[PDB]
Amino acid sequence: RFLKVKNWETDVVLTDTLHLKSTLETGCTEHICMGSIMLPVATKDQLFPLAKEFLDQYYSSIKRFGSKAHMDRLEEVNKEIESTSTYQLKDTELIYGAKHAWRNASRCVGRIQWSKLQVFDARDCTTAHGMFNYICNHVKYATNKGNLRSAITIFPQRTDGKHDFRVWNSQLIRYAGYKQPDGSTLGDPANVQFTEICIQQGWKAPRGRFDVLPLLLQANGNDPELFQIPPELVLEVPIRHPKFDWFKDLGLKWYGLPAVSNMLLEIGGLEFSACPFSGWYMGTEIGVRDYCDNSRYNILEEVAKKMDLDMRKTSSLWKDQALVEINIAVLYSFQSDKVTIVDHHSATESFIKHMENEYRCRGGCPADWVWIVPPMSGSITPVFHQEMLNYRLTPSFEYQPDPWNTHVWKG
Amino acid sequence: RFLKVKNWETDVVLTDTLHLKSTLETGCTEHICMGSIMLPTKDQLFPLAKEFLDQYYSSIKRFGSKAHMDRLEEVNKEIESTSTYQLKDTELIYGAKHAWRNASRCVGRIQWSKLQVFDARDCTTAHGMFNYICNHVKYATNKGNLRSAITIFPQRTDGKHDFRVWNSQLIRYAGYKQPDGSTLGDPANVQFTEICIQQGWKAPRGRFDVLPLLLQANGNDPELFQIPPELVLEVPIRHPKFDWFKDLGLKWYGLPAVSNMLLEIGGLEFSACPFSGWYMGTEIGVRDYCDNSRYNILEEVAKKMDLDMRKTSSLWKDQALVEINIAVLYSFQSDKVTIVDHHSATESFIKHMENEYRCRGGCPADWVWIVPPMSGSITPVFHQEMLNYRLTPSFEYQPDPWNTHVW
Ligand code: HEM
Ligand code: HEM
Ligand SMILES: Cc1cc(N)nc(C[C@H]2CNC[C@@H]2OCCNCCc2cccc(F)c2)c1
Ligand SMILES: Cc1cc(N)nc(C[C@H]2CNC[C@@H]2OCCNCCc2cccc(F)c2)c1
Ligand SMILES: C[C@H](O)[C@H](O)[C@H]1CNc2nc(N)[nH]c(=O)c2N1
Ligand SMILES: C[C@H](O)[C@H](O)[C@H]1CNc2nc(N)[nH]c(=O)c2N1
Ligand SMILES: [Zn+2]
């Protein structure tokens, strides 16, 4: 069965056949749409079929489907599963898998880049110290003095679920948040709880508005340990505005490397619970969400005051006005310091081209409109006008529960 | 069964039970989400009638009463004999208010129970339709103090005797294809505008020409009528800081009045049911003015503002977008024509969702449509999980009559 999607601005119609290759469930039914809900040990039994579909995909992609090498690999994996309860991916299969997980990431607008992903194989890692070292190398390689390069580091797979590798940070680089007794928060309110654990684990907190948090790393199911990323490795950008000289006096800065470290990577039924990956920022992620969310740094009012806007009524659009200025500032500051950034107009334009390409060559592109449409100026970006189809393909990146909720403390 | 929705800004969690009373299909399945698709007999009629009467009688706390059972028998018999039935006035008003209440794509529902219902079921000709419509326009406009209203024409019979308003809204501006290749006025209405000329409308060929009404009674060929100019409230668009804004030659009409939808109550189909409320500012300022395939005035405005148009990364479009929307709200407020900004409309909707969860056990809502087309995340609806499902009575789309009508 074929499905059509229309762009209402250009009239371009595309046909999706790829959704037929879809295994996993969405949360939706014929009676209810869950499209705006944020979140809607494996046995031999379930493992060989997952391995098989994955290796069929891999061998089709290299144009070797049905070959002796294809058949011998299936046989070898099947034998390894019966013998050991699991299996090991070849390096070529791991690279393909990590790339396809990004390719399949329906909420990611940056996917035009999917095939340029530097994969670091850290499956030989055994301790938290080894983790720390793999993570510094990643950050250095990805940062590249401001000329950012996409990368992922893959730590050993889950075995019995009792020996998990986890990065306890949600991103490799993030700022501390501190709850004061008066109920105000110092720093980033998103990281309050994580900051508290770090401190509990013996981190000596500088207690400022932008303290780069330490790494909290768990190897082999062991209790996690604290490490400070060398500051010379953390590229940061002071935020100023090209026309408002007072903007710099707000004291704002942000880090250049967005690196998600709390997702689970699934490839052919194997689960990689520590797989930090990084790209580069779209400006609105910092300027709209990190700075302007009421539950984040929440700087709209302060900026609006300094602009001397009329704040007595919402209908003056003072929030909207300050919002654009803050976002101008983020982009200007990054470009001036030669740190890779993309604005929402250019990123979305690129995504539409990627999506059309994908329909033509792959037969589809799963996309989550709720997430792809930028959080400001939605309808002046071409994605607002593009119909999309959301479905789950593997390999995939999945959410997982925060580790402090599940971890068995050894002591 | 029980479903929870979370607001990620406030941590408020609501439990939805109302979805279990849903009957129509969403377009989604377990395998695919279609949430961003724009368009995703006697035996047929009695269950539909019964389901509606049951909710009606329950709404007036008379479920299972003599009045209830008796009404069900009366409808059963009329269906058995005529193949259709007729709504009581009380049921028609209840059904209309509830079609609005159930409109998942509507952010302005807090107001649902204050809808004036005009029963035009005794209408028989296009001239009668015109009279009813002019009366609706004048009542709703209320010299700028807008009041919500719906006018309901005779229900479908065999489907060859349909009442239809061919306009998409009662008041819209013309669009003409030009020798240059560009478009004068509103490009969304190019097709409708040519049909009007094809029927003999003498077009002034300007940028803001109020379209005639084209009205179809009882399956007949449709007929042109000019709405009395003094019934069409319009707002000249000026800016509170920018003197030059007035000279862009922009204006808009005060009354948004959707006229191409179908109202379904208890299996009965009302194919002409124009309804109206008042604008949220972004509908005009973001969509009507700044969509690339609409008036598309972004390039022009940013030009007057002397912005850096060289790179998208100067956010010149975003800067201009904001100023335009300040202008729309300022103009309407200065002229005392009702309008709501996206911040206040979305705040009310969150209040309404809360009312509905505690009083009705839920509120169907389509996030893709509720979140305003600018400044999404600075409005509270952005951070609100919503469940979308289809309750009846409802408003539904229907094909454009020109692709269907038999001449
Ligand atoms: C190269 C530049 C990239 C850009 C500009 C970009 C952009 C974005 C944006 C804006 C989001 C939405 C997240 C939010 O706003 O909360 C997102 C989500 C996501 N992206 Fe990317 N991305 C990039 C690279 C990558 C890479 C390298 C990967 C992994 C290989 C990745 C995988 C994902 C995943 C799994 C999500 C979903 C996050 C979640 O569900 O919370 N992206 N992307
Ligand atoms: C009173 C003030 C009202 C406000 C501020 C308002 C707001 C809106 C908005 C912003 C939309 C989104 C459509 C778009 O962006 O193109 C919408 C859709 C809709 N509204 Fe309302 N509304 C109001 C009154 C009404 C009334 C009186 C009715 C019917 C009695 C109604 C029924 C609907 C329906 C059925 C839709 C979806 C139509 C479609 O799919 O195009 N609304 N509303
Ligand atoms: C690799 C990369 C590059 C880039 N520019 N941007 C990204 C997304 C992250 C950065 N800026 C925001 C995103 O952060 C990660 C997503 N946050 C969790 C989503 C979620 C799901 C379910 C429940 C929740 F409470 C939250 C990744
Ligand atoms: C009554 C009322 C008041 C108000 N403020 N706002 C409204 C929404 C209308 C006006 N501003 C635009 C909306 O017009 C109706 C929406 N048009 C149909 C959408 C659609 C769906 C599927 C396929 C398509 F091609 C098009 C109604
Ligand atoms: C409730 C709602 O689904 C939630 O706020 C989503 C909406 N869209 C988003 N889109 C992106 N890119 N990132 C987000 O965090 C969210 N949040
Ligand atoms: C493709 C997508 O479904 C389409 O552009 C929708 C998105 N959200 C919308 N939201 C509103 N309120 N009105 C619209 O016309 C649209 N268009
Ligand atoms: Zn869905």
Structure tokens at B124: 């028989």
The token pair at A137 is 């190398």
Q: Are A241 and A332 in contact (CB under 8 A)?
A: yes
Residues A373 and A351: beta-carbon distance below 8 Å? no
Residues forming beta bridges with residue B268, ordered by sequence position: B265
Q: At B330, which amino acid appears?
A: Y
The continuous run of DSSP H or E covering B133 comes out as helix B126-141
CA distance B186 to B123: 32
Domains delineated in chain B: 16-121+148-158+262-276+346-370 (3.90.340.10), 122-147+162-233+397-401 (3.90.440.10), 234-256+279-344 (3.90.1230.10)
Nearest-angstrom CA–CA distance, A237 and A240: 9
CA B115 from chain centre, in angstroms, equals 13
Comparing CA positions, the residue from A268, A275, A219 lying closest to residue A86 is A268
B324 and B373 in contact (C-beta within 8 Å)? no
Of A345, A178, A3, nearest in space to B32 by CA: A3
Helix (H) / strand (E) element for B357: namely helix B342-360
**B191 Cβ neighbours under 8 A, 6+ residues apart:** none
Cis peptide before B399 (omega within 30 of 0): no
| C-alpha separations of B376 from A229, A351, A377, B97, B363 in Å | 35, 19, 7, 28, 20
Picking from A30, A38, A369, the nearest residue to B385 by CB comes out as: A38
E strands along A79-176, which residues? 118-121, 151-154, 166-167
- Do the beta carbons of residue A302 and residue A250 sit within 8 Å? yes
The 10 Å Cβ neighbour count of residue A245 is 9
Cβ neighbors of B82 (< 8 A, separation 6 or more) are none
CA atoms within 13 A on the CB side of A228: 11
Residue of chain B nearest A29, judged by CA positions: B29
Q: How far apart are CA B367 and CA B376, in angstroms?
A: 11
Rounded Cα distance, B338 and A116, in Å: 53
CB-count burial class (<10 Å; 0-12, 13-18, 19+) for B111: middle
Residue A309 CA to residue B234 CA, distance in Å, equals 29
- Ligand 1 pocket, residues with Cβ under 6 angstroms: A 102, 105, 107-110, 113, 117, 150, 152, 263, 277, 279-280, 282, 285, 342, 347, 371, 397
What's the rounded Cα separation, in Å, for the pair B213 and A352? Answer: 38
What is the rounded CA–CA span in Å between residue B392 and residue B347?
26
B315 contact residues in A (CB cutoff 8 A): 324, 327-328, 331, 343
Angstrom distance (rounded) from CA B165 to CA B129: 9
Inspect the interface and report whether the beta carbons of B292 and A9 lie closer than 8 Å: yes
Written as one string, the DSSP assignment of B167-211 is: SSBSS-B-EEE-TTSSEEE-GGGHHHHHHHHHTT------SS-BP
Using DSSP's 3-state secondary structure scheme, residue A390 falls into strand
End-to-end CA, chain A? 55
DSSP H helices in A121-169: 128-143
What is the DSSP annotation of A203-215? ------TTPBPPE
- A287-299 burial, b at 16+ Cβ within 10 Å, e below that, comes to bbbbbbbeebbeb
Does A273 show up as a binding residue in the annotation? no
A187-216 core/surface letters (b: 16 or more CB in 10 A; e: else): bbbbbeebbbbbeeeebebeeebbbbbbbb
Answer yes or no: are the C-beta atoms of A122 and A153 closer than 8 Å: yes
Q: Establish whether residue B368 lines the binding site of ligand 6, counting it when its CB lies within 6 angstroms of any ligand atom.
A: yes
DSSP string, B81-113: HHSS----HHHHHHHHHHHHHT-TT-TTGGGTT
Distances in Å between the alpha carbon of B391 and those of A164, B270, B364, B388? Answer: 46, 17, 8, 10
* A123 three-state secondary structure: coil
DSSP three-state, residue B399: coil
CA B313 to chain centre: 35
SS3 A14: strand
Rama region for B107: left / alpha / beta (φ>0; ψ in -120 to 50; rest): alpha
> Residue B7 is which amino acid?
N
Give the mutation candidate from B313, B369, B388 for the A interface (greatest A CB count, under 10 A). B313
Q: Residue A166 forms beta bridges with which residues?
A: A218
DSSP B384: B
Is B341 in the A-facing interface, judged by CB distances under 8 Å?
A: yes
Distance between CA atoms of residues A344 and B215, nearest Å? 44
Residue in the structure block whose two tokens are 């030989």: A124
C-alpha span between A37 and B35 (Å, rounded): 12
Copy the structure tokens of residue B326. Answer: 């300040």
Burial annotation A331-366 (CB, 10 A radius, 16+ → b, else e): bbbbbeeebbbbbbbbbbbbbbebbeebbeeebbbb
One-character DSSP codes across A273-284: S---EE--EEHH
What is the number of other CB atoms lying within 10 angstroms of the CB of residue B181?
6
Specify the length of chain A in residues: 411
Give the separation between CA B354 and CA B360, rounded to whole angstroms: 10
Q: Beta B213-216 vs B223-225: how paired, if at all?
A: antiparallel
**Resolution of the structure in the document, Å:** 2.0
Please provide the DSSP assignment of B265-333 as one string: ETTEEES---EE---BHHIIIIIIHHSTTTT--HHHHHHHTT--TT-GGG-HHHHHHHHHHHHHHHHHH
- Mark which residues 269-308 of A lie under 8 Å from B by CB: 283, 288-289, 292-295, 300
Q: What is the β-pairing status of strands B234-236 and A215-218?
A: unpaired
Does residue A292 contact residue B378 with C-beta atoms inside 8 Å?
A: yes
- First-to-final CA distance of chain B: 50
Candidates A6, A14, A317: best to mutate against B (most CBs of B within 10 A) is A317
* Contact predicate B313/A336, CB 8 Å: no
Strand A277-278 with A259-260, pairing: antiparallel
- Three-class DSSP labels, B51-84: HHHHHHHHHCCCCCCHHHHHHHHHHHHHHHHHCC
Residues 6+ apart with CB under 8 A from A21: A393
Q: What are phi and psi of A239, to 5 degrees?
A: -95, 125
Nearest CA in chain A to B319: A324
Count CB pairs under 8 A between chains A and B. Answer: 199
Question: Torsion-angle region of residue A272: left (phi > 0), alpha (psi -120 to 50) or beta?
Answer: beta
Residue B190 CA to residue B49 CA, distance in Å, equals 40
Confirm if A3 and A16 have CB atoms less than 8 A apart.
yes
Q: List the single residue in B6, B315, B387 with the smallest CB-CB distance to A324.
A: B315
CA of B34 relative to ligand 4 center, distance in Å: 19
Q: Sheet with B268-270: list strands edge to edge.
A: B268-270, B262-265, B394-396
Closest CA to B162 of B216, B223, B86: B216
Contact B261, B273 (CB under 8 A): yes
Query: What's the rounded Cα separation, in Å, for the pair A366 and A371?
Result: 12
A287 DSSP assignment: I
Please list the alpha-helical segments (H only) found in A159-317: 192-200, 283-284, 291-292, 300-306
Q: Look at B22 and A37 and tell me if their CB atoms are within 8 Å.
A: no
Instruction: Select from A397, A411, A405 the least CA-distant residue to A100.
Output: A397
User: What are the structure tokens assigned to A362, written together?
Assistant: 């792959």
Of B209, B203, B125, nearest to B171 by C-alpha is B209
B274 to chain A nearest CA, in Å?
24
Which chain A residues touch B321 with a CB distance below 8 Å? 377, 380
CA triple A113-A114-A120, angle to 5 deg: 110
Q: What's the DSSP call for residue A124?
A: T
Write the Ramachandran bin of B266: left for phi over 0, alpha for psi from -120 to 50, otherwise beta. left
Choice from B92, B105, B260, B343 to test ligand 2 binding pocket (greatest atom count within 8 A of CB): B105
Residue B342: count other Cβ atoms within 10 Å of its Cβ: 29
Q: Sign of torsion, CA A341 A346 A349 A350? A: negative
DSSP A288: I
Which residues share a beta bridge with A7?
A: A386
Instruction: Choose, out of B340, B377, B379, B388, the residue to mutate when testing the contact with A (most A CBs < 10 Å).
Output: B377
H or E element in which residue A332 lies: helix A318-336
